[PDB]
Amino acid sequence: WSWESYLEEQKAITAPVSLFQDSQAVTHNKNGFKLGMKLEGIDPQHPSMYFILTVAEVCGYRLRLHFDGYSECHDFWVNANSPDIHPAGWFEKTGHKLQPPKGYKEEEFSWSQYLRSTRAQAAPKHLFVSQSHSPPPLGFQVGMKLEAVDRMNPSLVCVASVTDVVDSRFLVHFDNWDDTYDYWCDPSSPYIHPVGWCQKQGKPLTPPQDYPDPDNFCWEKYLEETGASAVPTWAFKVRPPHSFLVNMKLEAVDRRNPALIRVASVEDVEDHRIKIHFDGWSHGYDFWIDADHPDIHPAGWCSKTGHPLQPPL
Amino acid sequence: WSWESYLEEQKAITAPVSLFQDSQAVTHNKNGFKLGMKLEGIDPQHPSMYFILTVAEVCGYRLRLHFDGYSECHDFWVNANSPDIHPAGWFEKTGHKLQPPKGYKEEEFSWSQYLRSTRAQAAPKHLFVSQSHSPPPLGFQVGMKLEAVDRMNPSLVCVASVTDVVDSRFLVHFDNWDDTYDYWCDPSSPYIHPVGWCQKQGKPLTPPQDYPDPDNFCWEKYLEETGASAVPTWAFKVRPPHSFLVNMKLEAVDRRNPALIRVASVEDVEDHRIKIHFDGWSHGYDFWIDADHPDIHPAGWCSKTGHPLQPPL
Numbered sequence A, B: 001w002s003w004e005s006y007l008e009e010q011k012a013i014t015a016p017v018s019l020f021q022d023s024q025a026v027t028h029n030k031n032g033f034k035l036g037m038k039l040e041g042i043d044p045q046h047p048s049m050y051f052i053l054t055v056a057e058v059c060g061y062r063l064r065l066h067f068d069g070y071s072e073c074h075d076f077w078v079n080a081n082s083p084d085i086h087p088a089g090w091f092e093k094t095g096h097k098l099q100p101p102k103g104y105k106e107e108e109f110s111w112s113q114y115l116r117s118t119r120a121q122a123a124p125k126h127l128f129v130s131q132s133h134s135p136p137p138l139g140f141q142v143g144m145k146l147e148a149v150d151r152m153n154p155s156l157v158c159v160a161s162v163t164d165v166v167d168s169r170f171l172v173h174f175d176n177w178d179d180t181y182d183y184w185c186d187p188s189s190p191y192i193h194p195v196g197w198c199q200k201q202g203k204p205l206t207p208p209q210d211y212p213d214p215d216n217f218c219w220e221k222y223l224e225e226t227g228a229s230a231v232p233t234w235a236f237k238v239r240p241p242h243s244f245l246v247n248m249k250l251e252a253v254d255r256r257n258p259a260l261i262r263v264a265s266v267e268d269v270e271d272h273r274i275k276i277h278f279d280g281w282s283h284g285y286d287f288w289i290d291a292d293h294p295d296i297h298p299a300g301w302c303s304k305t306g307h308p309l310q311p312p313l
Helices: A003-010 A090-094 A111-118 A199-201 A219-225 A301-305 B003-009 B090-094 B111-118 B195-202 B219-226 B300-305
Strands: A037-045 A047-058 A062-067 A076-079 A145-149 A157-166 A170-175 A181-184 A249-253 A260-269 A273-278 A287-290 B038-043 B046-059 B063-065 B074-078 B145-149 B157-166 B169-174 B181-185 B249-253 B262-267 B273-278 B287-290
Touching: A003 A249, A037 A062, A037 A111, A047 A170, A145 A170, A145 A219, A249 A273, B038 B063, B038 B111, B046 B169, B145 B169, B145 B219
Parallel strands: none
Antiparallel strands: A037 A047, A047 A062, A062 A076, A145 A157, A157 A170, A170 A181, A249 A260, A260 A273, A273 A287, B038 B046, B046 B063, B063 B074, B145 B157, B157 B169, B169 B181, B249 B262, B262 B273, B273 B287
């Protein structure tokens, strides 16, 4: 419809561009991904693992990725500036493991030969914002230890490790646990803390799954025993709370059908999260989201990138 | 819109004024609070903690308070007869710690310096129902122990302490937990019991958050490790059940948008609580509230105090 006339009739304002990360706001980059191009990327359900992916669909600045050899029911959407996708050949050049297409074996797979056999085009390197050609996030080296909130069970702060580093980001892993609980972040993340923070704050720390003698959990000796260092405290930066206010309007991907983006409103706020309401829909579909999530955008993003915008219902 | 005409097409009745506490019903007091006045008061999210607050908005007998130095996203509404706000200078005169405005440290803060520098007016003392000028409640002293219901998890009766006393109310704190679960009450609260109550009544007692041998928690041992005594059994004088009947109508603050007061109905009753239904709205919006809560009021309260009433729908 038009944002302009909507704002007049509702007597409302949009969340200003300045409130968003540059990466959530940028509209002027073209999407150079094309149908059938091949690449590598993380599995959103197993964020430590990398698979061969194909571009199955492009919509504006977004793309839908298919896991080669597997079912289309696993396909998922990302933005073209996603740091979670990488060019063909990246895994080998940066020390990562590639899970091959269904029916291959890790060491059976070669990009040269795969491309010959498929006659497919690898997505060109220059498309990717993350190629491990930037120097890491200061002070966060693989194997180092920290305390982290289990984003799945937010009342728990837990023994955790850095297991992956890529450009300005690193992977937080829970000791003795599935990669299912892992998550990517950067040194300003509000979900991470230096070794000792729990003790110094009052809260209990959850030790590694099936550790010997859990209440008697000692960090400086866990550390000596694992040949690990804790991430230095000077490394952990303070992300300031976001400045979104209740009733500001924006555009947000609909988690019920991620192909769609909708007119939305800020229904509530915490320091680092906002509660999203889709205008014209039930408050039952209202949901909490991290302010820095890739799937929230300023008003006009859809229009400038060429993605349909769902008007209010 | 009028109450009479509604009570007619609905063949319904309003909760009589006599069912309410004097403080919930009183309409003839003027709201003397004015924009920009400064005061002290508790953080509702952290009810043990005191901050400098400014009057941000007034609406009838209510006001919106702002935490000096912090974001407007934390502002909250109270009634002008709230006992959880106090005049400038009250913290120092009564033994309370004052969390200073965002940049400061406790001991750096002085009101005389602050008022000189801001050119602001402190809310006059005569406006405050609670300034610690009344006799402390009879039996309940700071440091004394008791058993208390966790209002956030009402199946649990837990080990607790009195940590603050102001006029006839005191602050119930759950040992070893932060203050987010704490609450203010008086000697007649149905949520508090003496040490020994759970054992005498056959109910399980929840020990302090990280108590070493929680299976062997014992009160007479805890009291000796902590040098404390129990609030005397005789001090607990529970209030009688309220007399609100299902279908009676009244006015209630909307929990999801606290600026608004709406037409309401009693959907269901317990001895000390009522279930509020907002007329014309989904029953999914229905909520349980203590009958003495400051944000329910007799029909006519909005009209008599100068606050808008939202009609049903």
